[PDB]
């Protein structure tokens, strides 16, 4: 019993964190085999950030301009290349602590663990989700750039995010490990803002199914709904549209609890209309949207209470 | 910017988790040097009588894909100490510390000696923890990290009927009036950790959430009279002193913030949130707020 925002154990990722320094800029890098991956803005000054020409800035650099530090050991850079918004620094030593890994690009609504780092040293781990507006509500200070997001289903680390910047609303933007940004963002200091965000509907439904598994049913009702009528109501509360894929994905949780997806959609509609009336659901007074159907199946018991 | 429920990096603890099997019971153990620590209920009620009937070879200890050999055993309070023939090469610098209610720690939840997740939690005033544990999680540990040293403070033993959890320090002394057996046990009435709610209100002000700030202040006695009405723990002069740094950084005196908390307790949030929450959060200590809003590393 219980339901917590749970992160993956971070050890496999901690053994990959390094410090990358270029001139006056210091940030984090991810050392996998003989390559250190880091944001390409490590080659920029603050002035350069308005309209940086990364290709022109990079051609002026040599291997020995990049200082890479792994713990108390200085790694030697023997090559460099840029792939989209990430810099790949070839080093002369392979990381002996390299785990089994993959680079995966995720979709909005997906969750992942973030190992926040400063000066190549891990400070904390937390769980978060890729928002529908492609930002993440992280906890990052100056020097956190290069910190990574990951999942560890089984013994393989799937790296899905690398931190690049903080937007004016305090939310965060970054890339996959191939250097492609999530969202319409650029690694440039522009009048750049997060679009209006929405609630991840399929995740709120998963979390309501989690509450039923843990023994709480106060929010259920005798009604059902069509998918179209649910979406017409949901969009009035800034909730993401629920697709047939989302309904299919919730199938297992529907079979375990005995509550049809469209019946759970009816309960959600009523919660949006009424509020909680002094009650909580899994210790929360708001509808939680940062647990996926997969996270609920992984954390909750296989036997409903 | 941002404020998350943040756990310590778990790697130094992951390298200590092992699986312990005795008969039909399988649970987790903590392997430090040549000793594996685990709940004594793995042998399950006279515990010394149950233990005297066991030999070293009855305990099967598995570290990854390697079977460790048990060469001795002893009991210390509610913790079983299994002497093994191999010292853990991954043993970090560590200490066993007993924490107080209100203090927070990270939990590395494990099943079959394999870490599955890490989360942050607090020792409630009623000595329980609101954790996330299923069958097989016994032996999972709670810890904090100070520089390069792991301070182990909790070992999981059981789930109470309300779904909350109970356990011991690493010397086997329970937190709370609990016993390690199947009997009528219940968590006492819980209270809110006042000094922690205040720390979280300072974290909100630091992050640019000031709507609850007001021109008023209060005495410590008047604040405590109000706080007792809402099942909040009393605020002591030690708590006021501990909040000193956050008070100097934001310019809001601790009794100035107490007047804000009193108004929130008497009138609610009125449709508003603080750091994305509609409830007053009490599982961040003043030290957690300072650490997360400064970037301390390990
Ligand atoms: C203070 O607002 C943050 C943005 N800045 C105006 S800045 O610090 O000068 N800035 C500009 C900028 C522009 C583009 C890119 Cl790709 C990166 C960056 C940097 C950036 O975003 N770094 C940070 C990342 N995460 C978290 C932070 C938290 C605090 C402070 C920097 C944080 C630096
Ligand atoms: C209905 O929940 C209580 C479960 N038990 C009644 S039990 O499974 O029979 N039970 C009895 C018991 C008595 C004393 C001690 Cl020290 C430990 C234990 C065990 C216990 O508490 N183990 C669990 C720990 N954390 C989480 C759980 C979650 C589910 C199920 C066991 C969980 C087992
Ligand atoms: Cl995805």
Q: Where in chain B is the domain with CATH 2.40.10.10?
A: 1-14+93-190, 15-92
Between CA B208 and CA B2 the distance in angstroms is: 10
Length, in residues, of chain A:
305
| Beta-carbon separation of B10 and A9 below 8 A | yes
Which tokens go with A62?
């040599």
For residues A138 and A195, the answer to whether their CB atoms sit within 8 Å is no
Q: Enumerate the residues of chain B whose CB falls inside 8 A of the CB of residue A286.
A: 273, 276-278
Between CA B105 and CA A133 the distance in angstroms is: 33
B293's CB contacts (< 8 A; 6+ apart) are A141, B3, B203, B206
Which tokens go with A255?
């079979």
Distance, in angstroms, between B19 CA and closest chain A CA?
Answer: 17
Ligand 2 surroundings by CB, under 6 angstroms: A 1; B 41, 133-135, 137-138, 157-159, 165, 180-182
Of B264, B275, B269, the closest CA to residue B206 belongs to: B275
A to B CB pairs, distance under 8 Å: 130
Active site residues of A: 41, 145
Between CA B45 and CA A6 the distance in angstroms is: 35
Cross-chain CB nearest to A285 (options B133, B278, B297): B278
Distance, in angstroms, between B259 CA and closest chain A CA?
Answer: 23
For residues A149 and A100, the answer to whether their CB atoms sit within 8 Å is no
Superfamily for the B191-294 domain? main proteinase (3clpro) structure, domain 3 (1.10.1840.10)
**What own/partner pairs with CB < 8 Å and gap ≥ 24 does B47-54 have?**
B47/B75, B48/B75, B51/B75, B51/B80, B54/B22
Between CA B138 and CA B127 the distance in angstroms is: 17
Residue B65: exposure state from Cβ atoms within 10 A (0-12, 13-18, ≥19)? exposed
Q: Is the dihedral of CA A9, A13, A19, A22 positive or negative?
A: negative
Distance, in angstroms, between B124 CA and closest chain A CA?
Answer: 14
| Beta-carbon separation of A9 and B294 below 8 A | no
Fold category of B1-14+93-190 in CATH: Thrombin, subunit H (2.40.10)
Between CA B78 and CA B65 the distance in angstroms is: 28
For residues A182 and A263, the answer to whether their CB atoms sit within 8 Å is no
Fold category of A198-301 in CATH: main proteinase (3clpro) structure, domain 3 (1.10.1840)
Between CA B63 and CA B68 the distance in angstroms is: 7
For residues B149 and B95, the answer to whether their CB atoms sit within 8 Å is yes
H or E element: which one contains B20?
strand B17-22
For the domain A15-99, what is the CATH code?
Answer: 2.40.10.10
Interface test with A, best of B132, B133, B207, B293 (most A CBs within 10 A): B132
For residues B158 and B176, the answer to whether their CB atoms sit within 8 Å is no
Nearest-CA residue of chain A relative to B3? Answer: A139
For residues B121 and A4, the answer to whether their CB atoms sit within 8 Å is yes
Q: Where in chain A is the domain with CATH 2.40.10.10?
A: 1-14+100-197, 15-99
Ligand 2 atom closest to the CA of B165, numbered from 1? 25
For the domain A1-14+100-197, what is the CATH code?
Answer: 2.40.10.10
CA-to-CA separations, B124 to A218, A285, B96, B133, B229, in angstroms, rounded: 26, 19, 20, 16, 18
Cross-chain CB nearest to B9 (options A14, A172, A284): A14
For residues A112 and A106, the answer to whether their CB atoms sit within 8 Å is yes
Alpha helices in B15-163 (DSSP H): 47-52
From atom 3 of ligand 1, which residue's Cα is the shortest distance away?
A166
| Beta-carbon separation of A116 and B6 below 8 A | yes
- Annotated catalytic residue B293: no
Q: Where in chain A is the domain with CATH 1.10.1840.10?
A: 198-301
Cβ count near A63 (within 10 Å) = 14
Between CA A146 and CA A28 the distance in angstroms is: 4
Between CA A149 and CA B110 the distance in angstroms is: 21
Q: Where in chain B is the domain with CATH 1.10.1840.10?
A: 191-294
What resolution in angstroms does the PDB record give?
A: 1.7
Q: Enumerate the residues of chain A whose CB falls inside 8 A of the CB of residue B109.
A: 6
Nearest-CA residue of chain A relative to B147? Answer: A123
For residues B231 and B189, the answer to whether their CB atoms sit within 8 Å is yes
Q: Enumerate the residues of chain A whose CB falls inside 8 A of the CB of residue B295.
A: 116, 118, 123, 141, 143-144
CATH among 3.60.20.30, 2.40.10.10, 3.90.79.10, 1.10.3720.10 for B15-92:
2.40.10.10
Phi then psi dihedrals of residue A47, to 5 deg: -60, -50
Please, what is the angle between helix B254-267 and helix B194-206, to 10°? 100
């Amino acid at each position: 019993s219980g339901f917590r925002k749970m992160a993956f154990p971070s050890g496999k990722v901690e053994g990959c964190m390094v410090q990358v320094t270029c001139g006056t800029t210091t940030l984090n890098g991810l050392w996998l085999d003989d390559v250190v991956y880091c944001p390409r803005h490590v080659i920029c000054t603050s002035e350069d950030m308005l309209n940086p020409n990364y290709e022109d800035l990079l051609i002026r650099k040599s291997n020995h301009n990049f200082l890479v530090q792994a713990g108390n050991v200085q790694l030697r850079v023997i090559g460099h290349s840029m792939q989209n918004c990430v810099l790949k620094l070839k080093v002369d030593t392979a990381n002996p602590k390299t785990p089994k890994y993959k680079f995966v690009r995720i979709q909005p609504g997906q969750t992942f663990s973030v190992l926040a780092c400063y000066n190549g040293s891990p400070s904390g781990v937390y769980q978060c989700a890729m928002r529908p507006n492609f930002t993440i509500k992280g906890s990052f200070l100056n020097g956190s750039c290069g910190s990574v997001g990951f999942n560890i289903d089984y013994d393989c680390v799937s790296f899905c995010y690398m931190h690049h910047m903080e937007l004016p609303t305090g939310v965060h933007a970054g890339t996959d490990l191939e250097g492609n940004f999530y969202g319409p963002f650029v690694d440039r200091q522009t009048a750049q803002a997060a679009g209006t965000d929405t609630t991840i509907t399929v995740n709120v439904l998963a979390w309501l199914y989690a509450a039923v598994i843990n023994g709480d049913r106060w929010f259920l009702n005798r009604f059902t709904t069509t998918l179209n009528d649910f979406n017409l109501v949901a969009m009035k509360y800034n909730y993401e549209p629920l697709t047939q894929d989302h309904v299919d994905i919730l199938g297992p949780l529907s079979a375990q609890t005995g509550i049809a997806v469209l019946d759970m959609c009816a309960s959600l509609k009523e919660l949006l209309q009424n509020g909680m009336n002094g009650r909580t659901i899994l210790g929360s007074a708001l509808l939680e949207d940062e647990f996926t159907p997969f996270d609920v199946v992984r954390q909750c018991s296989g036997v409903t209470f």
